[PDB]
mmCIF file with all atom_site columns, C-alpha atoms (C1' of nucleotides) in Angstrom:
data_model
loop_
_atom_site.group_PDB
_atom_site.id
_atom_site.type_symbol
_atom_site.label_atom_id
_atom_site.label_alt_id
_atom_site.label_comp_id
_atom_site.label_asym_id
_atom_site.label_entity_id
_atom_site.label_seq_id
_atom_site.pdbx_PDB_ins_code
_atom_site.Cartn_x
_atom_site.Cartn_y
_atom_site.Cartn_z
_atom_site.occupancy
_atom_site.B_iso_or_equiv
_atom_site.pdbx_formal_charge
_atom_site.auth_seq_id
_atom_site.auth_comp_id
_atom_site.auth_asym_id
_atom_site.auth_atom_id
_atom_site.pdbx_PDB_model_num
ATOM 1   C CA    . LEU A 1 1   ? 231.518 74.290  294.916 1.00 0.00 ? 1   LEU A CA    1
ATOM 2   C CA    . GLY A 1 2   ? 232.099 73.376  291.697 1.00 0.00 ? 2   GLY A CA    1
ATOM 3   C CA    . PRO A 1 3   ? 232.918 71.187  287.924 1.00 0.00 ? 3   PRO A CA    1
ATOM 4   C CA    . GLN A 1 4   ? 235.180 68.375  289.992 1.00 0.00 ? 4   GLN A CA    1
ATOM 5   C CA    . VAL A 1 5   ? 237.404 67.742  287.136 1.00 0.00 ? 5   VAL A CA    1
ATOM 6   C CA    . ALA A 1 6   ? 241.440 68.470  286.486 1.00 0.00 ? 6   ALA A CA    1
ATOM 7   C CA    . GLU A 1 7   ? 241.322 71.785  284.908 1.00 0.00 ? 7   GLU A CA    1
ATOM 8   C CA    . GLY A 1 8   ? 243.329 71.411  282.057 1.00 0.00 ? 8   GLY A CA    1
ATOM 9   C CA    . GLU A 1 9   ? 240.093 69.936  280.839 1.00 0.00 ? 9   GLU A CA    1
ATOM 10  C CA    . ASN A 1 10  ? 237.392 73.326  279.696 1.00 0.00 ? 10  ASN A CA    1
ATOM 11  C CA    . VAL A 1 11  ? 234.426 73.208  281.180 1.00 0.00 ? 11  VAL A CA    1
ATOM 12  C CA    . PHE A 1 12  ? 231.662 75.655  279.067 1.00 0.00 ? 12  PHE A CA    1
ATOM 13  C CA    . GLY A 1 13  ? 229.219 77.860  280.242 1.00 0.00 ? 13  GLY A CA    1
ATOM 14  C CA    . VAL A 1 14  ? 227.274 79.905  277.229 1.00 0.00 ? 14  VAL A CA    1
ATOM 15  C CA    . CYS A 1 15  ? 226.817 83.328  277.319 1.00 0.00 ? 15  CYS A CA    1
ATOM 16  C CA    . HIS A 1 16  ? 223.688 85.221  275.551 1.00 0.00 ? 16  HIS A CA    1
ATOM 17  C CA    . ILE A 1 17  ? 225.547 89.213  275.147 1.00 0.00 ? 17  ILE A CA    1
ATOM 18  C CA    . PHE A 1 18  ? 222.015 91.338  273.776 1.00 0.00 ? 18  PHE A CA    1
ATOM 19  C CA    . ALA A 1 19  ? 223.212 93.396  272.243 1.00 0.00 ? 19  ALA A CA    1
ATOM 20  C CA    . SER A 1 20  ? 220.946 96.884  271.592 1.00 0.00 ? 20  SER A CA    1
ATOM 21  C CA    . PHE A 1 21  ? 221.175 100.657 271.656 1.00 0.00 ? 21  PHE A CA    1
ATOM 22  C CA    . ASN A 1 22  ? 218.714 100.860 274.633 1.00 0.00 ? 22  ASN A CA    1
ATOM 23  C CA    . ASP A 1 23  ? 221.764 98.592  277.006 1.00 0.00 ? 23  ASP A CA    1
ATOM 24  C CA    . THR A 1 24  ? 223.845 96.097  276.538 1.00 0.00 ? 24  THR A CA    1
ATOM 25  C CA    . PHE A 1 25  ? 223.148 92.415  278.385 1.00 0.00 ? 25  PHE A CA    1
ATOM 26  C CA    . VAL A 1 26  ? 225.646 89.758  279.584 1.00 0.00 ? 26  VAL A CA    1
ATOM 27  C CA    . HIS A 1 27  ? 224.182 86.830  280.709 1.00 0.00 ? 27  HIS A CA    1
ATOM 28  C CA    . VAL A 1 28  ? 225.629 83.863  281.443 1.00 0.00 ? 28  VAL A CA    1
ATOM 29  C CA    . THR A 1 29  ? 224.241 79.840  281.217 1.00 0.00 ? 29  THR A CA    1
ATOM 30  C CA    . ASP A 1 30  ? 224.581 76.617  282.178 1.00 0.00 ? 30  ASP A CA    1
ATOM 31  C CA    . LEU A 1 31  ? 224.818 74.314  278.476 1.00 0.00 ? 31  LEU A CA    1
ATOM 32  C CA    . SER A 1 32  ? 221.068 73.911  278.785 1.00 0.00 ? 32  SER A CA    1
ATOM 33  C CA    . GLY A 1 33  ? 219.580 77.172  279.240 1.00 0.00 ? 33  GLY A CA    1
ATOM 34  C CA    . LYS A 1 34  ? 217.671 76.726  281.523 1.00 0.00 ? 34  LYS A CA    1
ATOM 35  C CA    . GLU A 1 35  ? 219.332 77.207  285.314 1.00 0.00 ? 35  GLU A CA    1
ATOM 36  C CA    . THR A 1 36  ? 221.233 80.539  284.197 1.00 0.00 ? 36  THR A CA    1
ATOM 37  C CA    . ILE A 1 37  ? 223.732 82.236  287.164 1.00 0.00 ? 37  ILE A CA    1
ATOM 38  C CA    . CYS A 1 38  ? 223.982 86.048  286.516 1.00 0.00 ? 38  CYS A CA    1
ATOM 39  C CA    . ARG A 1 39  ? 222.745 88.483  284.545 1.00 0.00 ? 39  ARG A CA    1
ATOM 40  C CA    . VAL A 1 40  ? 225.165 91.613  284.153 1.00 0.00 ? 40  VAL A CA    1
ATOM 41  C CA    . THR A 1 41  ? 224.264 94.399  282.383 1.00 0.00 ? 41  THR A CA    1
ATOM 42  C CA    . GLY A 1 42  ? 225.402 97.072  280.747 1.00 0.00 ? 42  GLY A CA    1
ATOM 43  C CA    . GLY A 1 43  ? 223.199 99.252  282.825 1.00 0.00 ? 43  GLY A CA    1
ATOM 44  C CA    . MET A 1 44  ? 224.007 98.363  285.883 1.00 0.00 ? 44  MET A CA    1
ATOM 45  C CA    . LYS A 1 45  ? 227.851 100.091 285.727 1.00 0.00 ? 45  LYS A CA    1
ATOM 46  C CA    . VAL A 1 46  ? 227.575 103.556 285.222 1.00 0.00 ? 46  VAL A CA    1
ATOM 47  C CA    . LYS A 1 47  ? 223.939 105.809 287.027 1.00 0.00 ? 47  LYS A CA    1
ATOM 48  C CA    . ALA A 1 48  ? 223.006 107.429 283.249 1.00 0.00 ? 48  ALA A CA    1
ATOM 49  C CA    . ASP A 1 49  ? 220.244 106.481 280.532 1.00 0.00 ? 49  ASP A CA    1
ATOM 50  C CA    . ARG A 1 50  ? 222.452 108.235 278.261 1.00 0.00 ? 50  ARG A CA    1
ATOM 51  C CA    . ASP A 1 51  ? 225.610 106.042 278.776 1.00 0.00 ? 51  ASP A CA    1
ATOM 52  C CA    . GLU A 1 52  ? 223.480 102.979 278.345 1.00 0.00 ? 52  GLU A CA    1
ATOM 53  C CA    . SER A 1 53  ? 224.912 101.002 275.446 1.00 0.00 ? 53  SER A CA    1
ATOM 54  C CA    . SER A 1 54  ? 228.637 103.199 275.750 1.00 0.00 ? 54  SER A CA    1
ATOM 55  C CA    . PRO A 1 55  ? 231.733 100.374 274.862 1.00 0.00 ? 55  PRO A CA    1
ATOM 56  C CA    . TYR A 1 56  ? 233.303 101.361 278.731 1.00 0.00 ? 56  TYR A CA    1
ATOM 57  C CA    . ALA A 1 57  ? 229.647 100.658 279.566 1.00 0.00 ? 57  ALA A CA    1
ATOM 58  C CA    . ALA A 1 58  ? 230.257 96.805  278.391 1.00 0.00 ? 58  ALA A CA    1
ATOM 59  C CA    . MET A 1 59  ? 234.125 97.170  279.000 1.00 0.00 ? 59  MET A CA    1
ATOM 60  C CA    . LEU A 1 60  ? 232.658 96.751  282.444 1.00 0.00 ? 60  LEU A CA    1
ATOM 61  C CA    . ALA A 1 61  ? 229.581 94.451  282.221 1.00 0.00 ? 61  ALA A CA    1
ATOM 62  C CA    . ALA A 1 62  ? 231.418 91.413  281.337 1.00 0.00 ? 62  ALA A CA    1
ATOM 63  C CA    . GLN A 1 63  ? 234.297 91.956  284.004 1.00 0.00 ? 63  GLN A CA    1
ATOM 64  C CA    . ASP A 1 64  ? 232.204 91.059  286.949 1.00 0.00 ? 64  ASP A CA    1
ATOM 65  C CA    . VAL A 1 65  ? 230.498 89.022  285.098 1.00 0.00 ? 65  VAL A CA    1
ATOM 66  C CA    . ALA A 1 66  ? 233.898 87.169  284.362 1.00 0.00 ? 66  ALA A CA    1
ATOM 67  C CA    . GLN A 1 67  ? 234.836 87.516  288.625 1.00 0.00 ? 67  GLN A CA    1
ATOM 68  C CA    . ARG A 1 68  ? 230.839 85.089  289.342 1.00 0.00 ? 68  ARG A CA    1
ATOM 69  C CA    . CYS A 1 69  ? 231.731 82.250  287.071 1.00 0.00 ? 69  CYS A CA    1
ATOM 70  C CA    . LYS A 1 70  ? 235.577 82.130  287.856 1.00 0.00 ? 70  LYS A CA    1
ATOM 71  C CA    . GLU A 1 71  ? 234.451 81.912  291.724 1.00 0.00 ? 71  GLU A CA    1
ATOM 72  C CA    . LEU A 1 72  ? 232.219 79.098  290.428 1.00 0.00 ? 72  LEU A CA    1
ATOM 73  C CA    . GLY A 1 73  ? 234.936 77.452  287.800 1.00 0.00 ? 73  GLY A CA    1
ATOM 74  C CA    . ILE A 1 74  ? 234.005 77.472  284.624 1.00 0.00 ? 74  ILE A CA    1
ATOM 75  C CA    . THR A 1 75  ? 237.175 79.025  282.337 1.00 0.00 ? 75  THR A CA    1
ATOM 76  C CA    . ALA A 1 76  ? 235.829 78.673  278.698 1.00 0.00 ? 76  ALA A CA    1
ATOM 77  C CA    . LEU A 1 77  ? 232.307 80.779  277.546 1.00 0.00 ? 77  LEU A CA    1
ATOM 78  C CA    . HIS A 1 78  ? 230.360 79.994  274.367 1.00 0.00 ? 78  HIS A CA    1
ATOM 79  C CA    . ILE A 1 79  ? 228.927 83.261  272.886 1.00 0.00 ? 79  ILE A CA    1
ATOM 80  C CA    . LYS A 1 80  ? 225.996 83.706  271.365 1.00 0.00 ? 80  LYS A CA    1
ATOM 81  C CA    . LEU A 1 81  ? 225.512 87.457  270.110 1.00 0.00 ? 81  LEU A CA    1
ATOM 82  C CA    . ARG A 1 82  ? 222.010 88.775  269.384 1.00 0.00 ? 82  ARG A CA    1
ATOM 83  C CA    . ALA A 1 83  ? 220.567 91.946  267.805 1.00 0.00 ? 83  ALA A CA    1
ATOM 84  C CA    . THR A 1 84  ? 217.291 93.083  268.763 1.00 0.00 ? 84  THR A CA    1
ATOM 85  C CA    . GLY A 1 85  ? 216.125 92.036  265.763 1.00 0.00 ? 85  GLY A CA    1
ATOM 86  C CA    . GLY A 1 86  ? 212.495 91.110  264.736 1.00 0.00 ? 86  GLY A CA    1
ATOM 87  C CA    . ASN A 1 87  ? 211.005 94.011  263.346 1.00 0.00 ? 87  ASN A CA    1
ATOM 88  C CA    . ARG A 1 88  ? 213.480 96.154  264.583 1.00 0.00 ? 88  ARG A CA    1
ATOM 89  C CA    . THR A 1 89  ? 217.309 96.222  263.798 1.00 0.00 ? 89  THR A CA    1
ATOM 90  C CA    . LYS A 1 90  ? 219.254 93.639  262.832 1.00 0.00 ? 90  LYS A CA    1
ATOM 91  C CA    . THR A 1 91  ? 222.445 95.431  263.123 1.00 0.00 ? 91  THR A CA    1
ATOM 92  C CA    . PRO A 1 92  ? 224.471 94.691  266.314 1.00 0.00 ? 92  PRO A CA    1
ATOM 93  C CA    . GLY A 1 93  ? 224.446 97.236  269.457 1.00 0.00 ? 93  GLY A CA    1
ATOM 94  C CA    . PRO A 1 94  ? 228.219 99.366  269.815 1.00 0.00 ? 94  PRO A CA    1
ATOM 95  C CA    . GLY A 1 95  ? 228.705 97.631  272.822 1.00 0.00 ? 95  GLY A CA    1
ATOM 96  C CA    . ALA A 1 96  ? 229.006 94.077  272.352 1.00 0.00 ? 96  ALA A CA    1
ATOM 97  C CA    . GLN A 1 97  ? 232.900 94.107  270.878 1.00 0.00 ? 97  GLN A CA    1
ATOM 98  C CA    . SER A 1 98  ? 234.165 95.485  273.627 1.00 0.00 ? 98  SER A CA    1
ATOM 99  C CA    . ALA A 1 99  ? 232.396 92.967  276.303 1.00 0.00 ? 99  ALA A CA    1
ATOM 100 C CA    . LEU A 1 100 ? 233.738 90.181  274.052 1.00 0.00 ? 100 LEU A CA    1
ATOM 101 C CA    . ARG A 1 101 ? 237.067 91.618  274.694 1.00 0.00 ? 101 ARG A CA    1
ATOM 102 C CA    . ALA A 1 102 ? 236.052 92.448  278.156 1.00 0.00 ? 102 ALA A CA    1
ATOM 103 C CA    . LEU A 1 103 ? 235.680 88.672  278.648 1.00 0.00 ? 103 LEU A CA    1
ATOM 104 C CA    . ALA A 1 104 ? 238.619 87.793  276.815 1.00 0.00 ? 104 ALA A CA    1
ATOM 105 C CA    . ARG A 1 105 ? 240.659 89.508  278.713 1.00 0.00 ? 105 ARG A CA    1
ATOM 106 C CA    . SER A 1 106 ? 239.983 89.043  281.776 1.00 0.00 ? 106 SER A CA    1
ATOM 107 C CA    . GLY A 1 107 ? 241.047 85.084  281.782 1.00 0.00 ? 107 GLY A CA    1
ATOM 108 C CA    . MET A 1 108 ? 238.780 83.566  280.370 1.00 0.00 ? 108 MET A CA    1
ATOM 109 C CA    . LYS A 1 109 ? 238.394 81.394  276.891 1.00 0.00 ? 109 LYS A CA    1
ATOM 110 C CA    . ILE A 1 110 ? 235.737 81.319  274.543 1.00 0.00 ? 110 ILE A CA    1
ATOM 111 C CA    . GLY A 1 111 ? 234.287 78.402  272.571 1.00 0.00 ? 111 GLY A CA    1
ATOM 112 C CA    . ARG A 1 112 ? 232.085 78.966  269.927 1.00 0.00 ? 112 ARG A CA    1
ATOM 113 C CA    . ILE A 1 113 ? 230.885 82.081  267.965 1.00 0.00 ? 113 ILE A CA    1
ATOM 114 C CA    . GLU A 1 114 ? 227.369 82.193  266.703 1.00 0.00 ? 114 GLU A CA    1
ATOM 115 C CA    . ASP A 1 115 ? 224.521 85.251  265.659 1.00 0.00 ? 115 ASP A CA    1
ATOM 116 C CA    . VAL A 1 116 ? 221.372 84.040  266.738 1.00 0.00 ? 116 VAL A CA    1
ATOM 117 C CA    . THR A 1 117 ? 219.364 87.294  266.181 1.00 0.00 ? 117 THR A CA    1
ATOM 118 C CA    . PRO A 1 118 ? 215.285 86.822  265.734 1.00 0.00 ? 118 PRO A CA    1
ATOM 119 C CA    . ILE A 1 119 ? 215.245 86.990  261.775 1.00 0.00 ? 119 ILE A CA    1
ATOM 120 C CA    . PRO A 1 120 ? 211.435 86.530  260.992 1.00 0.00 ? 120 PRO A CA    1
ATOM 121 C CA    . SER A 1 121 ? 210.826 84.821  257.314 1.00 0.00 ? 121 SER A CA    1
ATOM 122 C CA    . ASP A 1 122 ? 207.916 88.080  257.426 1.00 0.00 ? 122 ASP A CA    1
ATOM 123 C CA    . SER A 1 123 ? 206.305 89.952  260.254 1.00 0.00 ? 123 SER A CA    1
ATOM 124 C CA    . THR A 1 124 ? 203.643 91.813  261.511 1.00 0.00 ? 124 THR A CA    1
ATOM 125 C CA    . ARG A 1 125 ? 203.129 95.612  261.072 1.00 0.00 ? 125 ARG A CA    1
ATOM 126 C CA    . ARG A 1 126 ? 206.419 97.634  261.930 1.00 0.00 ? 126 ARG A CA    1
ATOM 127 C CA    . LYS A 1 127 ? 206.418 100.249 264.760 1.00 0.00 ? 127 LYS A CA    1
ATOM 128 C CA    . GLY A 1 128 ? 205.997 103.771 262.586 1.00 0.00 ? 128 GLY A CA    1
ATOM 129 C CA    . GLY A 1 129 ? 204.089 104.899 260.054 1.00 0.00 ? 129 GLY A CA    1
ATOM 130 C CA    . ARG A 1 130 ? 203.596 105.027 256.401 1.00 0.00 ? 130 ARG A CA    1
ATOM 131 C CA    . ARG A 1 131 ? 205.666 108.058 256.398 1.00 0.00 ? 131 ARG A CA    1
ATOM 132 C CA    . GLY A 1 132 ? 207.966 106.824 258.866 1.00 0.00 ? 132 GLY A CA    1
ATOM 133 C CA    . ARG A 1 133 ? 210.127 108.776 261.864 1.00 0.00 ? 133 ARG A CA    1
ATOM 134 C CA    . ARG A 1 134 ? 210.047 112.254 261.024 1.00 0.00 ? 134 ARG A CA    1
ATOM 135 C CA    . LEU A 1 135 ? 212.577 113.569 263.065 1.00 0.00 ? 135 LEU A CA    1
ATOM 136 C "C1'" . G   B 2 1   ? 127.925 75.351  162.375 1.00 0.00 ? 1   G   B "C1'" 1
ATOM 137 C "C1'" . U   B 2 2   ? 132.988 72.415  163.656 1.00 0.00 ? 2   U   B "C1'" 1
ATOM 138 C "C1'" . U   B 2 3   ? 137.923 71.653  162.486 1.00 0.00 ? 3   U   B "C1'" 1
ATOM 139 C "C1'" . U   B 2 4   ? 143.050 72.002  162.100 1.00 0.00 ? 4   U   B "C1'" 1
ATOM 140 C "C1'" . U   B 2 5   ? 147.730 74.613  160.812 1.00 0.00 ? 5   U   B "C1'" 1
ATOM 141 C "C1'" . C   B 2 6   ? 150.332 79.552  163.131 1.00 0.00 ? 6   C   B "C1'" 1
ATOM 142 C "C1'" . G   B 2 7   ? 150.407 83.531  165.986 1.00 0.00 ? 7   G   B "C1'" 1
ATOM 143 C "C1'" . G   B 2 8   ? 151.487 84.932  171.251 1.00 0.00 ? 8   G   B "C1'" 1
ATOM 144 C "C1'" . A   B 2 9   ? 151.804 83.447  176.308 1.00 0.00 ? 9   A   B "C1'" 1
ATOM 145 C "C1'" . A   B 2 10  ? 152.256 80.568  181.632 1.00 0.00 ? 10  A   B "C1'" 1
ATOM 146 C "C1'" . C   B 2 11  ? 153.936 75.352  183.387 1.00 0.00 ? 11  C   B "C1'" 1
ATOM 147 C "C1'" . U   B 2 12  ? 156.821 70.475  183.438 1.00 0.00 ? 12  U   B "C1'" 1
ATOM 148 C "C1'" . G   B 2 13  ? 160.032 65.934  181.390 1.00 0.00 ? 13  G   B "C1'" 1
ATOM 149 C "C1'" . A   B 2 14  ? 164.033 63.854  178.996 1.00 0.00 ? 14  A   B "C1'" 1
ATOM 150 C "C1'" . G   B 2 15  ? 168.829 64.642  175.762 1.00 0.00 ? 15  G   B "C1'" 1
ATOM 151 C "C1'" . G   B 2 16  ? 173.255 67.318  173.376 1.00 0.00 ? 16  G   B "C1'" 1
ATOM 152 C "C1'" . C   B 2 17  ? 175.828 71.277  174.686 1.00 0.00 ? 17  C   B "C1'" 1
ATOM 153 C "C1'" . C   B 2 18  ? 179.543 74.467  178.082 1.00 0.00 ? 18  C   B "C1'" 1
ATOM 154 C "C1'" . A   B 2 19  ? 187.790 73.952  177.862 1.00 0.00 ? 19  A   B "C1'" 1
ATOM 155 C "C1'" . U   B 2 20  ? 181.022 73.357  182.106 1.00 0.00 ? 20  U   B "C1'" 1
ATOM 156 C "C1'" . G   B 2 21  ? 180.623 77.393  186.713 1.00 0.00 ? 21  G   B "C1'" 1
ATOM 157 C "C1'" . A   B 2 22  ? 184.313 78.295  193.059 1.00 0.00 ? 22  A   B "C1'" 1
ATOM 158 C "C1'" . U   B 2 23  ? 190.663 84.310  191.768 1.00 0.00 ? 23  U   B "C1'" 1
ATOM 159 C "C1'" . U   B 2 24  ? 194.799 83.676  194.910 1.00 0.00 ? 24  U   B "C1'" 1
ATOM 160 C "C1'" . A   B 2 25  ? 195.824 82.202  200.517 1.00 0.00 ? 25  A   B "C1'" 1
ATOM 161 C "C1'" . A   B 2 26  ? 197.699 89.227  202.469 1.00 0.00 ? 26  A   B "C1'" 1
ATOM 162 C "C1'" . G   B 2 27  ? 205.319 89.832  206.670 1.00 0.00 ? 27  G   B "C1'" 1
ATOM 163 C "C1'" . A   B 2 28  ? 195.280 90.467  207.498 1.00 0.00 ? 28  A   B "C1'" 1
ATOM 164 C "C1'" . G   B 2 29  ? 192.386 88.381  210.964 1.00 0.00 ? 29  G   B "C1'" 1
ATOM 165 C "C1'" . G   B 2 30  ? 190.269 84.128  213.005 1.00 0.00 ? 30  G   B "C1'" 1
ATOM 166 C "C1'" . G   B 2 31  ? 190.091 78.908  214.484 1.00 0.00 ? 31  G   B "C1'" 1
ATOM 167 C "C1'" . A   B 2 32  ? 192.494 74.249  214.670 1.00 0.00 ? 32  A   B "C1'" 1
ATOM 168 C "C1'" . C   B 2 33  ? 197.305 71.005  216.224 1.00 0.00 ? 33  C   B "C1'" 1
ATOM 169 C "C1'" . G   B 2 34  ? 202.429 70.437  218.656 1.00 0.00 ? 34  G   B "C1'" 1
ATOM 170 C "C1'" . G   B 2 35  ? 205.856 71.178  222.005 1.00 0.00 ? 35  G   B "C1'" 1
ATOM 171 C "C1'" . C   B 2 36  ? 206.823 74.283  225.774 1.00 0.00 ? 36  C   B "C1'" 1
ATOM 172 C "C1'" . C   B 2 37  ? 206.867 78.970  229.231 1.00 0.00 ? 37  C   B "C1'" 1
ATOM 173 C "C1'" . G   B 2 38  ? 205.121 82.282  232.567 1.00 0.00 ? 38  G   B "C1'" 1
ATOM 174 C "C1'" . G   B 2 39  ? 204.853 85.917  241.277 1.00 0.00 ? 39  G   B "C1'" 1
ATOM 175 C "C1'" . G   B 2 40  ? 198.396 84.779  235.528 1.00 0.00 ? 40  G   B "C1'" 1
ATOM 176 C "C1'" . G   B 2 41  ? 193.386 83.217  238.063 1.00 0.00 ? 41  G   B "C1'" 1
ATOM 177 C "C1'" . G   B 2 42  ? 189.737 80.319  241.167 1.00 0.00 ? 42  G   B "C1'" 1
ATOM 178 C "C1'" . C   B 2 43  ? 189.499 76.512  244.887 1.00 0.00 ? 43  C   B "C1'" 1
ATOM 179 C "C1'" . A   B 2 44  ? 191.535 73.003  248.013 1.00 0.00 ? 44  A   B "C1'" 1
ATOM 180 C "C1'" . U   B 2 45  ? 195.663 72.014  250.791 1.00 0.00 ? 45  U   B "C1'" 1
ATOM 181 C "C1'" . U   B 2 46  ? 200.674 72.849  253.077 1.00 0.00 ? 46  U   B "C1'" 1
ATOM 182 C "C1'" . C   B 2 47  ? 205.575 74.653  255.953 1.00 0.00 ? 47  C   B "C1'" 1
ATOM 183 C "C1'" . G   B 2 48  ? 208.512 78.792  258.101 1.00 0.00 ? 48  G   B "C1'" 1
ATOM 184 C "C1'" . U   B 2 49  ? 210.356 81.935  261.300 1.00 0.00 ? 49  U   B "C1'" 1
ATOM 185 C "C1'" . A   B 2 50  ? 209.153 86.283  264.317 1.00 0.00 ? 50  A   B "C1'" 1
ATOM 186 C "C1'" . U   B 2 51  ? 205.263 88.970  267.280 1.00 0.00 ? 51  U   B "C1'" 1
ATOM 187 C "C1'" . U   B 2 52  ? 201.496 89.051  271.280 1.00 0.00 ? 52  U   B "C1'" 1
ATOM 188 C "C1'" . G   B 2 53  ? 199.506 86.495  275.048 1.00 0.00 ? 53  G   B "C1'" 1
ATOM 189 C "C1'" . C   B 2 54  ? 199.284 81.747  278.219 1.00 0.00 ? 54  C   B "C1'" 1
ATOM 190 C "C1'" . G   B 2 55  ? 201.531 77.262  281.424 1.00 0.00 ? 55  G   B "C1'" 1
ATOM 191 C "C1'" . C   B 2 56  ? 206.420 76.144  283.484 1.00 0.00 ? 56  C   B "C1'" 1
ATOM 192 C "C1'" . C   B 2 57  ? 211.588 76.424  284.875 1.00 0.00 ? 57  C   B "C1'" 1
ATOM 193 C "C1'" . G   B 2 58  ? 216.063 79.450  286.072 1.00 0.00 ? 58  G   B "C1'" 1
ATOM 194 C "C1'" . C   B 2 59  ? 218.661 84.252  288.218 1.00 0.00 ? 59  C   B "C1'" 1
ATOM 195 C "C1'" . U   B 2 60  ? 217.710 88.649  289.609 1.00 0.00 ? 60  U   B "C1'" 1
ATOM 196 C "C1'" . A   B 2 61  ? 216.216 94.629  290.275 1.00 0.00 ? 61  A   B "C1'" 1
ATOM 197 C "C1'" . G   B 2 62  ? 215.843 96.799  286.903 1.00 0.00 ? 62  G   B "C1'" 1
ATOM 198 C "C1'" . A   B 2 63  ? 213.544 97.093  282.071 1.00 0.00 ? 63  A   B "C1'" 1
ATOM 199 C "C1'" . G   B 2 64  ? 210.493 100.420 277.596 1.00 0.00 ? 64  G   B "C1'" 1
ATOM 200 C "C1'" . G   B 2 65  ? 211.696 104.713 275.008 1.00 0.00 ? 65  G   B "C1'" 1
ATOM 201 C "C1'" . U   B 2 66  ? 214.603 109.634 273.646 1.00 0.00 ? 66  U   B "C1'" 1
ATOM 202 C "C1'" . G   B 2 67  ? 219.142 114.907 271.364 1.00 0.00 ? 67  G   B "C1'" 1
ATOM 203 C "C1'" . A   B 2 68  ? 217.754 114.720 275.988 1.00 0.00 ? 68  A   B "C1'" 1
ATOM 204 C "C1'" . A   B 2 69  ? 214.008 112.954 279.914 1.00 0.00 ? 69  A   B "C1'" 1
ATOM 205 C "C1'" . A   B 2 70  ? 209.246 111.760 281.520 1.00 0.00 ? 70  A   B "C1'" 1
ATOM 206 C "C1'" . U   B 2 71  ? 204.291 109.088 280.471 1.00 0.00 ? 71  U   B "C1'" 1
ATOM 207 C "C1'" . U   B 2 72  ? 204.354 102.684 281.492 1.00 0.00 ? 72  U   B "C1'" 1
ATOM 208 C "C1'" . C   B 2 73  ? 205.821 97.144  283.118 1.00 0.00 ? 73  C   B "C1'" 1
ATOM 209 C "C1'" . U   B 2 74  ? 208.117 94.845  288.652 1.00 0.00 ? 74  U   B "C1'" 1
ATOM 210 C "C1'" . U   B 2 75  ? 209.615 90.390  294.705 1.00 0.00 ? 75  U   B "C1'" 1
ATOM 211 C "C1'" . G   B 2 76  ? 200.212 91.270  293.151 1.00 0.00 ? 76  G   B "C1'" 1
ATOM 212 C "C1'" . G   B 2 77  ? 208.261 89.575  291.137 1.00 0.00 ? 77  G   B "C1'" 1
ATOM 213 C "C1'" . A   B 2 78  ? 209.546 92.992  285.346 1.00 0.00 ? 78  A   B "C1'" 1
ATOM 214 C "C1'" . C   B 2 79  ? 213.391 92.186  281.322 1.00 0.00 ? 79  C   B "C1'" 1
ATOM 215 C "C1'" . C   B 2 80  ? 216.823 87.679  279.990 1.00 0.00 ? 80  C   B "C1'" 1
ATOM 216 C "C1'" . G   B 2 81  ? 218.176 82.468  278.852 1.00 0.00 ? 81  G   B "C1'" 1
#
RNA sequence: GUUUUCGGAACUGAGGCCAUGAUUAAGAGGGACGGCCGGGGGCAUUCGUAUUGCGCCGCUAGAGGUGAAAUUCUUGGACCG
């Protein structure tokens, strides 16, 4: 079970670390993007809606996802870090570098680093009011 | 009784003469013309990513939002690629 190749060559999957402030996602996928493997979020580790985006919650989100693909023989990953973008914040969540460091310390290797977050040319109306979030 | 002259008006045709007759071109304005310039205006056409909805595939029980939660969507398979 796995790619029938010599271990000196490094196979490639792509992970899409969708970092936000509600939670952080780690969604490893093959190089096509079509047939995905496993989606170990940051919220699956701790049972607290406050701690759903903590930098430790992505330390454990990218430790279990480095065991399902190591079970299938994947040794080097492609990283597409993505903040929520669109009309919301285009600055990455705090649980992003921690999910990278847990992927780079669990024996796995990296490929390319690339920032695909949805930025518009220009978009529709923002969620709040004209006077904004009065808080 | 007639007829002139002059007087005084009113109107036309030649000629001479006028040093014959137009103040300049506003560090005022209008209008030409010349090469440019500008997210000026209108009509037609064209491109972009995003958002939302829909079709199919993948892997799966969480996802949304908050100072914290909760109203809300999920194998009448959500979020994610």
